[PDB]
Amino acid sequence: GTETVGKFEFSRKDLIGHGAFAVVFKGRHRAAHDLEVAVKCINKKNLAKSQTLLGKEIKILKELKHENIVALYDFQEMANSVYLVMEYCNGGDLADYLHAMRTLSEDTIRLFLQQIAGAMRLLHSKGIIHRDLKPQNILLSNPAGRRANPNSIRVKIADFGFARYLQSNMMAATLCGSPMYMAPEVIMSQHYDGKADLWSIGTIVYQCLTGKAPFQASSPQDLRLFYEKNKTLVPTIPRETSAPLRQLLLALLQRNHKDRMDFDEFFHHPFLDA
Ligand SMILES: c1ccc2c(Nc3cc(C4CCC4)[nH]n3)nc(Nc3ccc4nc[nH]c4c3)nc2c1
Numbered sequence: 001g002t003e004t005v006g007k008f009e010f011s012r013k014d015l016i017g018h019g020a021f022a023v024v025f026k027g028r029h030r031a032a033h034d035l036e037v038a039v040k041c042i043n044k045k046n047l048a049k050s051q052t053l054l055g056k057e058i059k060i061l062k063e064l065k066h067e068n069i070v071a072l073y074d075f076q077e078m079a080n081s082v083y084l085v086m087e088y089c090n091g092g093d094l095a096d097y098l099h100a101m102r103t104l105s106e107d108t109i110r111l112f113l114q115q116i117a118g119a120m121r122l123l124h125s126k127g128i129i130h131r132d133l134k135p136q137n138i139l140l141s142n143p144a145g146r147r148a149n150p151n152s153i154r155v156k157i158a159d160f161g162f163a164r165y166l167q168s169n170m171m172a173a174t175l176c177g178s179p180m181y182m183a184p185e186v187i188m189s190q191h192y193d194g195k196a197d198l199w200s201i202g203t204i205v206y207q208c209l210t211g212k213a214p215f216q217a218s219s220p221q222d223l224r225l226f227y228e229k230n231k232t233l234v235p236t237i238p239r240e241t242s243a244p245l246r247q248l249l250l251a252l253l254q255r256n257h258k259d260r261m262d263f264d265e266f267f268h269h270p271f272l273d274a
Contacts, residue, residue, distance in 0.1 A: 202252025
């Protein structure tokens with residue numbers, strides 16, 4: 001029936017989410033039932049890798065407290081089980097929101113990107129790269145429910161199981177992330193750095209604007225080959241897109257990470273102001 005983790009409880013009937021490496025249930029605080037949580041647990045179908053990823057996510061999330069990072073309230077790590085008690089975001093993920101809305105207005109995109117940028121400032125200052133940014137890993141919190149403004153929505157980054165520290169004079173080479181949101185250097189099995197995350201942000205923004213990822217293929221292999229053959233990548237951006245947002249997209253969606261927008265440029269882009 002009811003299972004308990006510290007001061008929190010959940011039942012496995014309340015399944016929120018399922019992946020290869022985690023299973024997520026809705027739960028609540030045992031003493032304040034109105035305080036909702038999401039409890040992330042091992043997926044026993046991939047026991048070893050799931051246990052490893054959840055352990056790593058605990059390590060990273062312990063260091064990252066921010067309004068736009070889904071919060072770790074508590075956790076419980078044992079030899080044969082791992083639980084993470086997470087902030088509950090009632091609005092679901094950005095991918096589903098985009099399906100419902102079809103596209104977002106530039107004003108909404110600005111509101112969401114300002115918030116993503118604030119969380120990315122904290123990762124950058126800590127020397128952490130996320131490596132799995134995609135709309136499914138952006139959660140929305142809508143505390144005001146049906147009576148909420150656009151400004152009311154809070155956006156929060158989730159899933160730090162693939163994140164790592166990267167020393168400023170080093171490069172990463174681990175192949176991870178989701179093919180359609182992976183920087184070209186990542187999917188081509190090359191060395192990469194924090195600018196890979198900036199490509200993924202660019203793809204997320206493009207998808208908000210158009211409803212589609214910017215470069216599509218019938219398979220990851222085919223996407224790799226496409227990136228390998230095309231030295232210049234220009235996403236197809238709708239003609240009515242404002243010039244500042246267009247400039248931002250083109251700077252983020254640079255094939256070559258040397259040419260790509262860097263963090264200081266992203267953080268201070270005028271689109272994020274007005
Ligand atoms: C309706 C209402 C709420 C949700 C929801 N809420 C969550 C999820 C979490 C934290 C557990 C890790 C994030 N806090 N709040 N999540 C989901 N799906 C999901 C659940 C785990 C996820 N991990 C990465 N992306 C995920 C996407 N659907 C929903 C549909």
